[PDB]
Design goal:
Blueprint (H helix, E strand, L loop, with lengths): L12 E2 L6 E2 L2 H7 L15
Antiparallel strand pairs: 1-2
The structure holds zinc ion.
């Protein structure tokens, strides 16, 4: 785990679907889409 202070620069915008971080709002709001949208074919498996 986190011994102590690891995440010093906690970004404001952070995705929950995958778990990524961003600086701008549009960047995230435009990224999250990747998950939810309209894909032709996908394994949708993990
Ligand atoms: Zn994401």
């Amino acid at each position: 785990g986190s011994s102590g202070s690891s995440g010093t620069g906690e970004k404001p915008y952070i995705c929950n679907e995958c778990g990524k971080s961003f600086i701008q709002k549009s960047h995230l709001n435009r990224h999250r889409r990747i998950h939810t949208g309209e894909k032709p074919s996908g394994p949708s498996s993990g």
